[PDB]
Amino acid sequence: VADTADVLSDVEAEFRAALGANINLAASTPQGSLVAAEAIARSSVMRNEARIANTINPNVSFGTFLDAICALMGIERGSDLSTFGYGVQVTGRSQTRISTGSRVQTPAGAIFTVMSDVTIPAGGVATIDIKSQEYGNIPLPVGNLIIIDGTIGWSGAKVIASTRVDPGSRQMSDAELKNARVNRLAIQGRNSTMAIKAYVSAVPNVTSVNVIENNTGAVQVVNGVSFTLPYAVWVCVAGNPDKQAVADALWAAHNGGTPWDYGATNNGVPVDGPNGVPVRDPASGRKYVVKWTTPIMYDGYVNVTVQQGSSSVAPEAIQNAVVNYAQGKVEGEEGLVVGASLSAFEVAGAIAREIPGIYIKLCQVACVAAGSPAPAPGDFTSEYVMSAFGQATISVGNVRVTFV
Amino acid sequence: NISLTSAKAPDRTRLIAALDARSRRDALDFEVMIPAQVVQYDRAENIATIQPLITWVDTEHNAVQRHQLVDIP
Amino acid sequence: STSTIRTGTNNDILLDDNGNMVILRDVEACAQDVRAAMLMRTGENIFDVNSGVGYFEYIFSPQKSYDDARKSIADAILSSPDVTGIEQLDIDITGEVFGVDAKVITIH
Amino acid sequence: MKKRILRVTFNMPYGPEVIREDLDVRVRIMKAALRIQNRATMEIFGLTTQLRESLLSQFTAWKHRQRQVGREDELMIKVSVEAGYSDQGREQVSRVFVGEVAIVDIISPPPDIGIRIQCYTRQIDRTKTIRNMPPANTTFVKFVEWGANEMGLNFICDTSYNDQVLKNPGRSITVASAILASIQDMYMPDVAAFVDDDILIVKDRDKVIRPDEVTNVNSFVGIPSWSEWGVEFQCLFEPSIRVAGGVAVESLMNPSVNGNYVITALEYDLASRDRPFYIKVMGSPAA
Amino acid sequence: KIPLTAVPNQAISFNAGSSYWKIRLYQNMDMMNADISRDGVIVCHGVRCFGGIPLLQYSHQYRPDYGNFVFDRDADWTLFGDGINLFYLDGAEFAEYQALAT
Fold it and tell me: Which chain D residues are within 8 Å of E18, Cβ to Cβ?
């Protein structure tokens, strides 16, 4: 009941008319041809559009898939802005700052001012910022530019004291099909490992999460060497403006033990040495034991050797081809998460899913720690088997293309 | 007896009275020349913020300050 | 300026020896149309209520005057695409039958 | 046989006073896409001594209690007009005008004493001043937004000129009324700025504000004809017709003028005991 | 509230919560169905009407900060305006009511 047959449809009416009225015509020229043909051109629409409303399959669906999500996940996503605060500007004497004073950062800032201000005798005043778009963007540590100015306000100043609230980014159905298999939570006191992973993955601004669990004592097959019955969670969060709700969500879904890096391992950066210290529990219990760590950030590098292909493919499109697979916006490939084993086969094969017609003679990839110089010309292999302590990332400049 | 507007009772009697009222209103909004003062100035571009020094009268004979003009050469 | 598919004395599609469903041109299309219209009954036409002849309320029911039958039949003869005006309606009611005769005028 | 409904509402300090359709009320309304505010002339007959004393004495046009705790209602009262039809007890009333009384008169002598009233939309602003400094260097849309906040009206702006920087846009505006003249002046005539009911609308000349609410019109009391700007016709009271909205026109005598048009100006002639109950429409080609 | 009338198929346009709304109500066999439009662009199509359950079910559309609509009982066009009301709720009230629903 998944596919429809339409090759035998015309026969149905061509013989319905024959055994109905009389045995004559059913030809193409006469009037009856018209009726017989239209009763089929409309029967096909019937047969197609009766099925298409069936599937409901989690895949294949669209738009109505929001309800297949809402059967379990109470939310998919939202649309908020990267509002700022604690700003400051370099200015002169008795200047009347106005609203909508647009400040543009070098990575497409386009940032207004939220409320009006007047310059003081000191020469420095505080102004607020709101992003002109509704996606997740970050401000640079220093002031960059000012657009709307009175030739007396010299420059906008970014400091360390300021805050950055990270927003969400709309939705993608092809991304809903991906995070659906992960965000499914459960209905007792909320104490299973899959429940923990699904509850943590639903917190805003959390790209990926890893959870592992012992059951046996001494060491476990997954990475980790220390406590006898630990629970290791390796959240990959851009930020936690609710710095305790990133921990309160972990706590509310958690029963067992909380170690730092399995407890005693090395070379993983935890949130701190002493406890994460959640604020409080509503059950009159002052129990604060929550421990989680962030991945050891890495870098990425991709190189390819492509023939000319069949069409005039610009060498700039292939760079955007791989960044989507890294960011996991394609339908089917999850993306770069913890333990994402960066491979040339998984990447250079997927670039053909957007720009076919080209012949890929060769491609080899490798990576090194972030903020370090590029590897040797011979330092490129096909695969990169990846540990569970960290994840890799890909930027636009790291990709080099030769049309050899 | 503040009258809410600069309107006169004999107006609306004839067409010429209304014509004179609209003529006065159109003349008043026409701006040419008044004294002013400097609020801010930078010697390097010949642009100065300027605050005119003559106010606006109201039906209660009050004083309403004008608005500062920026980047005036 | 009209057309229709020919039917027999019973209202079915009538097919020639070649079996061709024929598009009748004017005049006899008008005769077939008016014959079908006068036999349509009221309360049978969906999407158009109050269209038809009220046989069960005006003719078959006991009635005083019998001008209502004439008006209803004249209206049903009208509303055809081509009829211009009605020349004569007689309404005999001689014997047990209810004799009705009519002559219509068309553009052609 | 449907009956017509014509209600005029007055907001006295103690509460509302409604003149129903049972009396003799005549009203003419004129609306357009311009800075000049809308107008309504009202003819009211049969007012008794009590109602005359209650209403005509509040149209003072002088100022009382100079201290002026608050504003708006402590200067002039507000009048709202809604007209429609009633059939089988089922109503289809719709509001058509909001304004404040400006000019008073007396038309007919006894035995039947009738008065005439002049109302204007957003006339409260001709007394209220500006207390929020306009932005110095800014785009068009932010100037419009500041004006909307200052007057106190919900606004919609949709123009191709939304990303143009203006220098000192409104540094010479005395009261709140000249904001609209400022907004209209810059990009005349392509950009039309007008205040309808209680909404500020700034848009291009030939854009329909609501693309999915096109009213199909196929029954005209006044035969449609070309009017060297578009089309112009007349109909009975249709609540769907608004300013800046679109119309789809299908004619019988004049089928060469069928098409989609954007509404520019309107006129209303509504009476409770006379023949006129009409709406006149002028249109421009849709873009 | 939202003024209504006893007609099998109807539509209403109004300005609610600092935005323009257009609700189209029609009867589909047994249940009643609605189509919601905001500011000229569609939101949801053919959503069923039940008492209490809001018309905007999906998470993103109903609000970042806008409101929602709720019926007091099961929809029936022969009882509209006569013991049957439709209520629009602002962001804060609807958030509180949604939390209270659990």
Answer: 154
Residue linked to tokens 């109909």: D235
Q: Is B1 on the interface with D (CB under 8 A)?
A: yes
Residues of A within 8 A of E58 (CB-CB) are 66-67, 70, 76
Question: What CA–CA distances, in Å, run from D196 to D153, D155, D203?
Answer: 10, 10, 13
User: Which residue of chain E comes nearest to D92, CA vs CA?
Assistant: E5
* DSSP codes, E21-40: EEEEEEE-SSSEEEEEEETT
**Contact yes or no for B40 and A152 at CB 8 A:** yes
- Whether chain A lies against chain C with 3 or more Cβ pairs closer than 8 A is yes
Say yes or no for a CB contact (<8 Å) between D138 and A100: yes
In 3D space, the residue among A205, A207, A401 whose CA is nearest the CA of residue A320 turns out to be A401
The residue assigned the tokens 């107008």 is D39
A117 at interface of D, judged by CB pairs closer than 8 A: no
Interface membership of E83 toward A (CB under 8 Å): no
Instruction: Please report the DSSP string for D60-85 in residue order.
Output: --S---TT-SS-STTT--EEEEEEEE
Using a 10 angstrom Cβ sphere, with 0-12 exposed, 13-18 middle and 19 or more buried, the burial of residue E97 is middle
Element (H, E) at B27: helix B15-28
What is the rounded end-to-end Cα distance, in angstroms, of chain A? 50
Resolution to one decimal, Å: 3.6
In angstroms, the CA D198 to CA D148 distance is: 10
CA A153 – CA D156 distance, rounded (Å): 32
By CB atoms closer than 10 A (0-12, 13-18, 19+), residue C32 is: middle
* D142 CB within 8 Å of a chain A CB: yes
Cα separation, D180 vs D194, in Å, equals 7
Tell me the DSSP string of A136-175: -----SS----SS--SS--EEE--SS--B--------HHH
* DSSP E strand boundaries for A203-299: 206-208, 211-213, 231-233, 236-237
Alpha carbon distances (Å) from C5 to B67, C11, C34: 84, 11, 14
Experimental method: cryo-EM
